[PDB]
Amino acid sequence: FARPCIPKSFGYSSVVCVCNATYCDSFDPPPALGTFSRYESTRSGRRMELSMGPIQANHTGTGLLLTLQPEQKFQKVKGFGGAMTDAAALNILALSPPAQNLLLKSYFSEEGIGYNIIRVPMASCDFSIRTYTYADTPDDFQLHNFSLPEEDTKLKIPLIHRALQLAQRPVSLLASPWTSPTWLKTNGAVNGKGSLKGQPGDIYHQTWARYFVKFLDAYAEHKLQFWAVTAENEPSAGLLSGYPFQCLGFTPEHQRDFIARDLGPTLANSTHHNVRLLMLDDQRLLLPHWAKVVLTDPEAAKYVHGIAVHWYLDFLAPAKATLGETHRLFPNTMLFASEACVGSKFWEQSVRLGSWDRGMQYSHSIITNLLYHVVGWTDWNLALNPEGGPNWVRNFVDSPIIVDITKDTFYKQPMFYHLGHFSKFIPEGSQRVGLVASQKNDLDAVALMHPDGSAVVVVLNRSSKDVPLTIKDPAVGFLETISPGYSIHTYLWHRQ
Ligand SMILES: *[C@@H]1O[C@H](CO)[C@@H](O[C@@H]2O[C@H](CO)[C@@H](O[C@@H]3O[C@H](CO)[C@@H](O)[C@H](O)[C@@H]3O)[C@H](O)[C@H]2NC(C)=O)[C@H](O[C@@H]2O[C@@H](C)[C@@H](O)[C@@H](O)[C@@H]2O)[C@H]1NC(C)=O
Ligand SMILES: CCCCCCCC/N=C1/SC[C@@H]2[C@@H](O)[C@H](O)[C@@H](O)[C@H](O)N12
Ligand SMILES: [K+]
Question: What happens upon changing residue 339 to G?
Fold first, then answer.
C-alpha cells in the first residue's frame, strides 16, 4: 500500500517525511507499451510521486531534446547503499521494534528504495562510541585472541541479517578497516600519523593481512559473506600528522607492495578467494596517480578488482581528469564510490533537517559519477541522531535518516529520496548508455538500460527555472515532459 509522506518543516528549504512505530511513507505494488512512468520529487514537497504519460511517434520544435544512444554501451552497475556503522546500528536499535522494521524496510525492501550494498567497518571508526580492534591483546602475531565484540555480534550482524531478509535483491557486503591493532603500528596509537611497522612482506604485514581473513572467518561463522573489501579506509589520513581518529597511513607505493606481497596472496589462499579487493578508498584527486603506482605492478594488479573513491575533495578534482583519465588508462578496473556524507565541514551545521540542497548534492554526485564510469555509490552512516552522531571525536555529519529516540520517530530527508531515485530504479547489472543533448542546458541527466532491456533516465534540475524537454528513444518514440526547477525525476519505459 502507498502511504503519502507526512511532511514536517524545520525551517530549511524543504520538508522531511515523518515516520514512527505505526506509519511510514511507502509505494504501491509495481508500465504498459507506448507509455512511460515518471517519478518526481520537488523542493516544494513531492516525494517520488508517480505519474504516466504517452510515448509519441513524432516530435517537432526546437526545445531541449535528449537522445538515447542505446548502442553506446558503458559500465554495468553494481548498485547503491549505505554503511552500518556502530552509530547507525545504535540509532536504529534506539527505536521500538516496529519503527526499526519500517526504517529497515525504507532502505532494503522493494517497497522502499531497494538498497543492495552495505558497507561494514572492520572494528571501530570515528562513528563508534569506543575505541577497539578485534585483536587488542599486544604482540598476538598469531591472532589467537582475535574476537568480534558485541558491537558486531549483538548490533551490526543481527541488523544486517534483518536487512537481508527484507531484500528481494541480493545484497552485497563491503568491508573496510580504519585502524589495525596499535601494536602493529609505528606510533602505537589508533589515530595520528603512523603506519604499519616494518615493510610489506614482513611479520607485521603478514599479521595485518591475516586479520582480514580472520574477520571474514568470524563473519562467515555468523552466516554473512562479503562481496568486497577495501585495502584501507582513506590511507592518506594516516600520513597526516595529528589525524584525530582511527587511521593507518599508506603511501601509494606502500599500498602496492602490501597488496602484492601480503594482502593479495593471503586472500587468494583462503576459503575467501572470491571476495573482491578494492584499492584506494580515498579522494578522487589521488587518481590517476595511485592507479598508476599500484596497477602498473603486475604483481599487485593481479589482485585488485577495483578502485574505491570518497567524494569529499571533489571540488579540487574535475571528474574527467581523475575518473575519466583513470578509466581511459585502466578500463578493466572498476571505479566505485564507497563513501559520502554532507555536513562534515567545520563551518557547516552537521544536520540540516529538510535541506533540499543536500539532496541535490547526492544526485548531482551520483549522476556525475555514472557519467564517468563509476559502477556503484554508497552513502555513509544509514541513520544518525539529530546532532549527527554519536561519534567519539564529535566528527558529526548528516544522514538520509535522522532518528529521534525520545519521540520513537525518524525523519527521511531529501537525501533519502534523491538516492531512491537511483537505487529503486537501477538494479544490479543495469548498463549505462549514451545520452546527448541538443543544446547547452543546466540539467544533469543520465540514461541506463535495465537487464530486461527496458530504459531508465534520471533528470536532475539544479536551477530555479522550469525546462520543458523531450527525450528521444530511437524506434520507440518521444516523451514530452518538463523538468521543474529544483526537481529530480526518474523516467522508466519498456522498449519491448
Ligand atoms: C505516527 O504517525 C501517524 C501518521 O502521521 C499518526 O497518525 C495520525 O494522527 C494525526 C494527528 O494526531 C491524525 O489527524 C487528524 O484528523 C482530524 C480530521 O479527521 C484533523 O482535524 C486533525 O487536525 C488531524 O489532521 C491523522 O489522521 C493520523 N494519520 C494517519 C494517516 O493515521 C500517529 O498518531 C497516533 O495515532 C492516531 C490515529 C491518533 O490517535 C493520534 O493522536 C496519535 O498521535 C503516529 N503515532 C504516534 C505515536 O504519534
Ligand atoms: C585534511 C583534509 C580534510 C578534508 C576531509 C577529509 C575526508 C574525510 N571527511 C569525512 S566526513 C565523515 C567521514 C568520516 O566519518 C569517515 O570516517 C572518513 O572516512 C572520512 O574522512 N570522512
Ligand atoms: K560540521
Answer: 1000-fold decreases of glucosylceramidase activity
